[PDB]
């Protein structure tokens, strides 16, 4: 359920074309926000 | 059921406005850019006048086209007087200068959202009314600080108590740098040169028993904390200096929220008065001063003239600002690919604010008290 | 006050294309003290 | 790619970029990578 | 500020179901647009 996403401290982005809903994570978003090799977390 | 639900709610009142009423607006055209410029002219004798045209009366260029400037010293003026010989070949060659003033306009706004479930299954059925009342009131509040922050930042007349010169200098550790009766009158004297005119006429005196007569003064906006220091303030003759408002209420007219008057200032208390919190000195052994947030807290004393606040309104029809609201009630209005059910609402408030501070001779004196 | 506006009024051999301007203010000051005993002066060191 | 059909035919979904303009295309690992609280829940490939 | 995001070059989308904005980076977009272990950028 969608409420379970928010309860996990998780935000979610809608998809216009063919996804419907894509769940977006803070590690993922921080990964997703990156110009080059410099701005990714130590885990990557 | 275990309790009775009283319907009427306790709602906080809105802080009364004190600064937005004193500003005058200047319309800014739409199609053109986001800045307004002015050309302020200075007197020839004023020391602000700097110019290359400076040939000495009896000689060559001396890089001073303001004659004696603003020296006001009898040991200087005779030497720099435009003495001219019989042969009128060359003279002072005075120059003139204009000052460019630049004013910017910025954008600010709000938004908040609510779900249909929140409005429907809530204990109180007046949730919508309370939200919009709280939202618009805060927009009124925020606008006030926008004005006040700029006015505090821009003030040519900035007197510091004692021997202090900067915010960091102020402390309550030793001899606390506080407002003195001597300090207040000098600020008026400095304001007496020009700009700020005499806000109010002098009070002649009405037939009563206790009434006193006060001189023409200019409104000085003060925070509530510093009011006590102004109250117990000894004059040179060890008598009172804070003339209470009641002692001239019968004679003259009254400005809103007045407490009293000192010399050439009528004290105005503003509930929402911003302060330089924790910007003084480190509080090692703070002798019970309310001014304590990490360091000593510096409080202002503001005296706005009548020519030092030009608020620029982009499209505001003769107002400091307009609020532009947009309500999208849950339902069909908010049906889209994101939410194909419409269980979301939205309200956003947008506005445009800007100030100029032309002729910056407003008075802002600091104080660390209480 | 003498004001030579740019144009013909300032056309000369130095500047055939008269472009410069001028404005000069001159006066004679003068001062006579008939009765100096009626003038009174008090000197003072100001506070702060 | 060539058209908006190609990404959908490829299986990759496509999200509309509101601030900046464009169409960010999301794949299965990209979404599975993106949905991650901490280092623990990343694909075996990373 | 949002302009700093755009001026940097990073785009941004809108998080509808809870949250504000997530900002898309260049590497992240390439990372995000990967099917298998041979379609993501070299760094990751």
Segment holding B267, helix H or strand E: strand B265-269
* Disruptive mutation site among A6, A11, A14, A21 for chain B (greatest number of B CBs within 10 Å): A14
CB atoms within 10 A of CB B60: 8
CB atoms within 10 A of CB C33: 8
C-alpha D13/C-alpha A20 separation (Å) is: 9
Q: If DSSP codes are grouped into helix, strand and coil, which group holds residue B102?
A: strand
Distance from CA of C25 to the nearest CA of B (A): 10
> What's the Cα-to-Cα distance from E5 to each of A41, D15, E11, rounded to whole Å?
19, 19, 7
Residues in chain D: 46
Flag whether residue D36 sits within 8 Å of chain A, measured between CB atoms. Answer: yes
* Nearest to D6, CA basis, from D22, D20, D25, D31: D25
Q: Please report the resolution in angstroms.
A: 3.3
Number of helices (H), then strands (E), in chain E? 2, 2
Q: What is the dihedral of CA B303, B308, B314, B316, to 10 degrees?
A: 50
C-alpha B273/C-alpha E41 separation (Å) is: 55
Method: cryo-EM
C-alpha B94/C-alpha C22 separation (Å) is: 11
* Disruptive mutation site among A19, A23, A34 for chain E (greatest number of E CBs within 10 Å): A34
Of E13, E33, E37, Cβ closest to residue D25:
E33
Chains that touch E (3 or more CB pairs under 8 A): A, B, D
> What's the Cα-to-Cα distance from B324 to each of B111, B347, B351, D38, rounded to whole Å?
11, 10, 6, 42
> What's the Cα-to-Cα distance from D34 to each of A25, D29, E34, rounded to whole Å?
6, 8, 11
Question: Which residues lie closer than 8 Å to C3 by C-beta, 6 or more apart?
Answer: C21, C22, C23, C24
Residues in chain E: 44
Of E13, E15, E25, Cβ closest to residue A34:
E25
C-alpha B195/C-alpha B80 separation (Å) is: 28
**Residues B225 and B277: beta-carbon distance below 8 Å:** no
DSSP 8-state assignment for residue B144: H
Smallest CA–CA distance from B91 into chain C, residue? C24
Which chain B residues touch E16 with a CB distance below 8 Å?
338-339
Q: If DSSP codes are grouped into helix, strand and coil, which group holds residue B101?
A: strand
**Residues B229 and B269: beta-carbon distance below 8 Å:** no
Flag whether residue A31 sits within 8 Å of chain E, measured between CB atoms. Answer: yes
Which chain E residues touch B339 with a CB distance below 8 Å?
16
Of B84, B88, B186, Cβ closest to residue C48:
B186
Pair type for strands B258-262 and B243-244: antiparallel
DSSP assignment of B151-188: HHH--SB---STT--STTT--SSSS-----HHHHHHHH
């Amino acid at each position: 359920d969608v409420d379970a996403i928010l309860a996990d401290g998780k935000q979610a982005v809608a998809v216009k074309h063919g996804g419907g809903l894509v769940v977006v994570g803070e590690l993922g978003a921080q990964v997703l926000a990156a110009k080059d090799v410099s701005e990714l977390p130590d885990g990557v | 059921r275990l309790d009775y639900y009283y319907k009427k709610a306790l709602v906080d009142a809105a802080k009364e406005m004190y600064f937005g009423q004193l500003a005058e607006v200047t319309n800014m055209p739409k199609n053109m850019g986001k800045q307004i410029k002015l050309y302020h002219y200075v007197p020839l004798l004023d020391d602000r006048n700097v110019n290359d045209q400076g040939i000495d009366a009896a000689g060559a260029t001396i890089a001073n086209g303001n004659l004696y400037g603003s020296s006001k010293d009898i040991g200087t003026i005779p030497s720099k007087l435009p003495a001219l010989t019989e042969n009128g070949g060359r003279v002072n060659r005075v120059g003139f200068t204009r000052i460019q003033l630049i004013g910017s306009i910025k954008k600010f706004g709000f938004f908040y959202e609510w779900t249909q479930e929140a409005m429907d299954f809530d204990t109180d059925e007046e949730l919508d009314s309370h939200l919009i009342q709280e939202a618009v009131k805060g927009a009124n509040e925020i606008t006030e600080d926008q004005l006040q922050i700029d006015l505090l930042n821009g003030a040519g007349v900035v007197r510091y108590p004692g021997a202090a010169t900067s915010n960091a200098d102020m402390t309550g550790e030793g001899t606390a740098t506080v407002v003195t009766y001597e300090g207040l009158v000098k600020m008026g004297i400095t304001l007496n040169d020009n700009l700020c005119p005499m806000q109010t006429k002098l009070i002649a005196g009405s037939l009563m028993t206790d009434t006193r007569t006060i001189q023409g003064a200019r409104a000085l906006y003060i925070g509530s904390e510093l009011e006590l220091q102004l109250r117990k303030m000894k004059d040179p003759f060890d008598n009172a200096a804070f003339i209470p408002v009641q002692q001239y209420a019968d004679a003259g007219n009254l400005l809103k929220g007045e407490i009293g008057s000192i010399a050439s200032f009528r004290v105005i208390v503003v509930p929402k008065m911003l302060k330089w919190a924790g910007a003084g000195a480190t509080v090692t052994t703070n002798p019970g001063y309310y001014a304590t947030s990490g360091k000593y807290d510096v409080f202002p004393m503001l005296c706005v003239g009548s020519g030092s606040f030009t608020t620029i309104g982009f499209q505001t029809d003769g107002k400091t600002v307009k609020f532009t609201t947009y309500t999208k009630k849950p339902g069909i209005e908010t049906v889209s690919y994101a939410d194909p059910y419409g269980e979301m609402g939205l309200t956003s408030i947008k506005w445009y604010y800007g100030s100029l501070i032309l002729r910056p001779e407003w008075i802002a004196l600091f104080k660390t008290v209480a | 006050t003498y004001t030579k506006k740019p144009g013909i009024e300032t056309v000369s051999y130095a500047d055939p294309y008269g472009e410069m301007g001028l404005t000069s203010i001159k006066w004679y000051y003068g001062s006579l003290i008939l009765r100096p005993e009626w003038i009174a002066l008090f000197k003072t060191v100001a506070a702060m």
